[PDB]
Amino acid sequence: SGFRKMAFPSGKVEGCMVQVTCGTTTLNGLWLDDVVYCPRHVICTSEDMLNPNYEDLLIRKSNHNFLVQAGNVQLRVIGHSMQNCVLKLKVDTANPKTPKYKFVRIQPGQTFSVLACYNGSPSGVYQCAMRPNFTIKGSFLNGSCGSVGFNIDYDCVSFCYMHHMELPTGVHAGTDLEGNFYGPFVDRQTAQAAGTDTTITVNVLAWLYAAVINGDRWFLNRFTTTLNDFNLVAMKYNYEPLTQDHVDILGPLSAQTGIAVLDMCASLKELLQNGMNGRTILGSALLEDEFTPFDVVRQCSGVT
Amino acid sequence: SGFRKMAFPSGKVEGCMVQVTCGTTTLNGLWLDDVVYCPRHVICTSEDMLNPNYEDLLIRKSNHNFLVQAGNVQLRVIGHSMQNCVLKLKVDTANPKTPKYKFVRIQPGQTFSVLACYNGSPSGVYQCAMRPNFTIKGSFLNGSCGSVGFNIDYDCVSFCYMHHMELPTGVHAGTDLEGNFYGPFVDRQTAQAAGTDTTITVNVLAWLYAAVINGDRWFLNRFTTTLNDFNLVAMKYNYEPLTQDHVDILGPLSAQTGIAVLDMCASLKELLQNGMNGRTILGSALLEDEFTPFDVVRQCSGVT
Ligand SMILES: CC(=O)N1CCN(CC(=O)Nc2cnccc2C2CC2)CC1
Ligand SMILES: CC(=O)N1CCN(CC(=O)Nc2cnccc2C2CC2)CC1
């Protein structure tokens, strides 16, 4: 029993972190096989960030201008290329600790673990979600760029995020490992406002199921609703619309607890309208939305 | 910017996890040098847990009755001894991945990371605190016993907790790595009720400083208080008394933000009396107390 915001064990990713320096800028890189991936803004000065022409700035850089250090040992860079907003630095040595891996592009609402790093060294691990506005609410200071987000399926690490930017509002933006930004964000120091950060409804319902499984049941009510009625309330509260696909995904939690998905929707509808009244659910005074239905099943079953 | 509940990178601890089986019970063990540490209740049947005589039950066990498996390879047990509530299984092979380590006994209010494991395999990592009633609010299912809590200081892992029990109320109890339980708990399936789970005041203040550093400043008020006046309110709200030692520990955060510790106490006093009014601080609707002042400085500075 008990339910925690839990990150994946970070060891497999720690073995991939390296430091990348270009000129006066140092950030993190991800070393997989003989390639080091890092944000292309490693080539920029503070001034360059205002309106960078990456293709032009990159012409002035050679392989020897990218300093890659793994622990206290220097890697030899034998090639470099830009793919979208990431640089791929080909090195002469395959990372001996390369785990089984995939590069995946996640959808909003999906959760992942971040291994926050500085100077190629891991500082901490935390769990977050791709927000519906394509930002993430992370914990990143200057030097954390190139830190990555990932999920693990037994022994395969699916990398889904690489940190690039902090928006003027303190929220974060980054790319998948092919260098494509999530959402409309760009690697330029300019006005980039985020859209509405709506609540991930299917994750809230999954978390209410985790609460019932772990004994917190006070919010269960005598009501039911329909998808259309629920969605009218969800729209009003800036919650994402719930679809039949989401109801299907919640099926195993509904089966385990015996609480129909639409009945849990009705409980959530009353929590939205009435509030918590100073009460808590799984130690929280707000409805948590950074646990997917898969995370709830995984934690409640004990998948290693 | 941004502030997350962050655990230490778990890799150094993942390299120490092993599976320990005795008869029909399988749990986790911690392999450091040539010793495997695990809860002594690995020797108990479900019936034994009701009123176990560990010294008597242990007489019926020999070295060959303890099966230790590291990955898919079996370790040879050449000695076994009980130290308080843990067994120390001497093996013929030193763990090649043994990090620099210490065994420490933490005080209530101190935080640590847990690497939750099943069958010697890591499932996730999360952050928690030793509650003032000596319980921890973890996420542990059957098979998680022997999972450990730790802190890291650069390259040295200080192990502070080993999981042993889930109380009838769903909260958790365990020992330090010398096998001494935190608090009054025992490794027996009997009535063990926890005391008052008070809020760790100095951690709440540290977290309010993290909020100011990260832009959430709405709760800062025009008031101050004294330790004695603050403590009268803290007692009423089931918060731990704040001491001059706590004020001293908050000194660096006070210096960084320019907000005197007693002024932050006055802001906290108004939050306790007035509530949040539907507002949030660092994405939370309740006052978070599982960040120590050291955790706040570490995260806000980027220690690796
Ligand atoms: C060379 C340069 O001025 N750069 C290179 C691009 N970066 C982009 C950027 O947003 N990085 C960043 C990401 N997360 C947290 C914090 C920061 C930094 C304090 C801003 C800004 C700094
Ligand atoms: C042999 C036996 O019956 N044991 C051995 C001692 N254990 C003690 C115990 O509290 N373990 C435990 C810890 N955390 C979460 C969950 C559990 C278990 C479901 C109870 C109980 C089970």
State the Cα–Cα distance between residues A206 and A40, nearest whole angstrom.
Answer: 37
* Helices B293-301, B201-213: inter-axial angle, 10-degree rounding: 20
Instruction: Enumerate the H helices of A223-304 as residue ranges.
Output: 227-236, 244-249, 251-257, 261-274, 293-301
Q: What is the B135 CA–ligand 2 centroid distance (Å)?
A: 15
State the Cα–Cα distance between residues A70 and A21, nearest whole angstrom.
Answer: 12
Which residues of A belong to the active site?
A: 41, 145
B126 and B4 in contact (C-beta within 8 Å)?
Answer: no
Q: Which two tokens stand for residue A292?
A: 């997917």
Q: Which two tokens stand for residue B185?
A: 């708990």
Q: What is the A166 CA–ligand 1 centroid distance (Å)?
A: 6
State the Cα–Cα distance between residues B207 and A130, nearest whole angstrom.
Answer: 24
Instruction: Say yes or no for a CB contact (<8 Å) between B124 and A299.
Output: yes
Closest listed residue to residue A143, CA positions, set A161, A127, A166, A126: A166
Print burial letters for A261-292: b (CB count within 10 Å at least 16), e (below 16): bbbbbbbbbbbbeeebeeeebbebbbbbbbbb
Check if B141 has its Cβ closer than 6 Å to any atom of ligand 2: yes
A154 and A166 in contact (C-beta within 8 Å)?
Answer: no
| Residues in CB range of B232: below 8 A, 6 or more apart | none
Distances in whole angstroms, Cα of residue B172 to Cα of each of A139, B37, B115, B182, B185: 28, 19, 14, 10, 10
Interface of A with B in 123-162 (CB under 8 A): 123-126, 128, 137-141, 143-144
Distances in whole angstroms, Cα of residue A228 to Cα of each of A86, A206, A225, A231, A242: 42, 19, 8, 5, 9
A chain contacts of residue B116, beta-carbon cutoff 8 Å? 6
Q: Which CATH class is domain A198-301?
A: mainly alpha
Residue recorded with tokens 């080091």? A36
Hey, what long-range contacts does B300-303 have (CB within 8 A, 24 or more apart)? B300/A141, B300/B3, B300/B210, B300/B213, B300/B214, B300/B256, B301/A141, B302/A118, B302/A123, B302/A141, B302/A143, B302/A144, B303/A123
B3 and B108 in contact (C-beta within 8 Å)?
Answer: no
State the Cα–Cα distance between residues A19 and A69, nearest whole angstrom.
Answer: 5
Name the phi and psi angles at A57, rounded to 5: -65, -35
Chain centre distance of CA B89: 24
CA-nearest residue, atom 8 of ligand 1: A165
Say yes or no: B98 contacts chain A, CB-CB below 8 A.
Answer: no
B281 and B238 in contact (C-beta within 8 Å)?
Answer: no
| Residues in CB range of B178: below 8 A, 6 or more apart | B83, B84, B86, B103, B105
Closest listed residue to residue B174, CA positions, set B166, B14, B192: B166
B199 and B233 in contact (C-beta within 8 Å)?
Answer: no
State the Cα–Cα distance between residues A87 and B131, nearest whole angstrom.
Answer: 46
Of B1, B213, B299, B300, the one to substitute when testing ligand 1's pocket (max ligand atoms within 8 A of C-beta) is B1
Q: Output the CA torsion sign for A81, A86, A91, A95.
A: negative
Torsion of Cα atoms, A177 then A178 then A182 then A187, to 10°: 100
First-last CA distance in chain A: 17
Check if B147 has its Cβ closer than 6 Å to any atom of ligand 2: no
* Helices B227-236, B261-274: inter-axial angle, 10-degree rounding: 30
Instruction: Say yes or no for a CB contact (<8 Å) between A2 and B125.
Output: no
Annotated domain spans of chain B: 1-14+100-197, 15-99, 198-301
State the Cα–Cα distance between residues A188 and B196, nearest whole angstrom.
Answer: 51
Instruction: Say yes or no for a CB contact (<8 Å) between B10 and A15.
Output: no
State the Cα–Cα distance between residues B12 and B251, nearest whole angstrom.
Answer: 32
Return the DSSP state at A28. E
Residue recorded with tokens 């406002």? A193
Say yes or no: A9 contacts chain B, CB-CB below 8 A.
Answer: yes
First-last CA distance in chain B: 17
Q: Which two tokens stand for residue B279?
A: 């507002």
Helices (H) and strands (E) in chain A, counts: 8, 13
State the Cα–Cα distance between residues B31 and B260, nearest whole angstrom.
Answer: 46
* Burial bucket for residue A6 (CB in 10 Å: 0-12, 13-18, 19+): buried
A chain contacts of residue B274, beta-carbon cutoff 8 Å? none
Residue in A286, A301, A304 nearest the CB of B280: A286
- Region of B189 (left: φ > 0; alpha: ψ -120 to 50; beta: rest) is beta
Q: According to the 3-state scheme, what is the secondary structure of chain B?
A: CCCCCCECCCHHHHCCEEEEEECCEEEEEEEECCEEEEEHHHHCCCCHHHCCCHHHHHHCCCHHHEEEEECCEEECEEEEEEECCEEEEEECCCCCCCCEEEECCCCCCCEEEEEEEECCEEEEEEEEECCCCCCECCCCCCCCCCCEEEEEECCEEEEEEEEEEECCCCCEEEECCCCCECCCCCCCCCCCCCCCCCECHHHHHHHHHHHHHCCCCCCCCCCCCCHHHHHHHHHHCCECCCCHHHHHHCHHHHHHHCCCHHHHHHHHHHHHHHCCCCCCECCECCCCCCCCHHHHHHHHHCCC
State the Cα–Cα distance between residues B257 and B267, nearest whole angstrom.
Answer: 14
The atom number, within ligand 1, closest to the CA of B1 reads 15
State the Cα–Cα distance between residues B303 and B294, nearest whole angstrom.
Answer: 11
- At residue A220, what is the residue type? L
* Burial bucket for residue B203 (CB in 10 Å: 0-12, 13-18, 19+): buried
Question: In this structure, which CATH number among 2.40.50.140, 3.40.50.720, 2.40.10.10, 3.40.50.300 belongs to the domain B1-14+100-197?
Answer: 2.40.10.10
State the Cα–Cα distance between residues B110 and B276, nearest whole angstrom.
Answer: 26
| Residues in CB range of A128: below 8 A, 6 or more apart | A111, A112, A113, A114, A136, A137, A138, A149, A290, B4
Are both A1-14+100-197 and A15-99 of the same fold? Answer: yes
State the Cα–Cα distance between residues A71 and A119, nearest whole angstrom.
Answer: 10
State the Cα–Cα distance between residues A209 and B68, nearest whole angstrom.
Answer: 36
Chain centre distance of CA B111: 6
Distances in whole angstroms, Cα of residue A262 to Cα of each of A214, A224, A233, A266: 20, 6, 13, 6
Question: CA angle A244-A247-A248, nearest 5°?
Answer: 90
Name the phi and psi angles at B160, rounded to 5: -125, -15
Of A21, A42, A45, A49, the one to substitute when testing ligand 1's pocket (max ligand atoms within 8 A of C-beta) is A49
- Residues counted in chain B: 304
Distances in whole angstroms, Cα of residue A27 to Cα of each of A43, A179, A182: 10, 16, 20
A2 and B137 in contact (C-beta within 8 Å)?
Answer: yes
The atom number, within ligand 2, closest to the CA of B172 reads 14
| Residues in CB range of B228: below 8 A, 6 or more apart | none
**What is the CATH architecture of A15-99?**
Beta Barrel (2.40)
State the Cα–Cα distance between residues B56 and A78, nearest whole angstrom.
Answer: 65
B298 to chain A, closest Cα gap in Å: 9
| Residues in CB range of B236: below 8 A, 6 or more apart | none
State the Cα–Cα distance between residues B82 and A167, nearest whole angstrom.
Answer: 55
State the Cα–Cα distance between residues B212 and B86, nearest whole angstrom.
Answer: 43
State the Cα–Cα distance between residues A50 and A53, nearest whole angstrom.
Answer: 10
Question: CA angle B181-B183-B189, nearest 5°?
Answer: 65
State the Cα–Cα distance between residues B38 and B86, nearest whole angstrom.
Answer: 6
Closest listed residue to residue B214, CA positions, set B280, B285, B304, B151: B280
| Residues in CB range of A221: below 8 A, 6 or more apart | A266, A267, A270
State the Cα–Cα distance between residues A163 and B2, nearest whole angstrom.
Answer: 13
Question: CA angle A126-A132-A137, nearest 5°?
Answer: 30
- At residue B108, what is the residue type? P
State the Cα–Cα distance between residues B146 and B141, nearest whole angstrom.
Answer: 12
Return the DSSP state at A181. B
Return the DSSP state at A288. -
- At residue B23, what is the residue type? G
Return the DSSP state at A98. P
Closest listed residue to residue B168, CA positions, set B194, B142, B148: B194
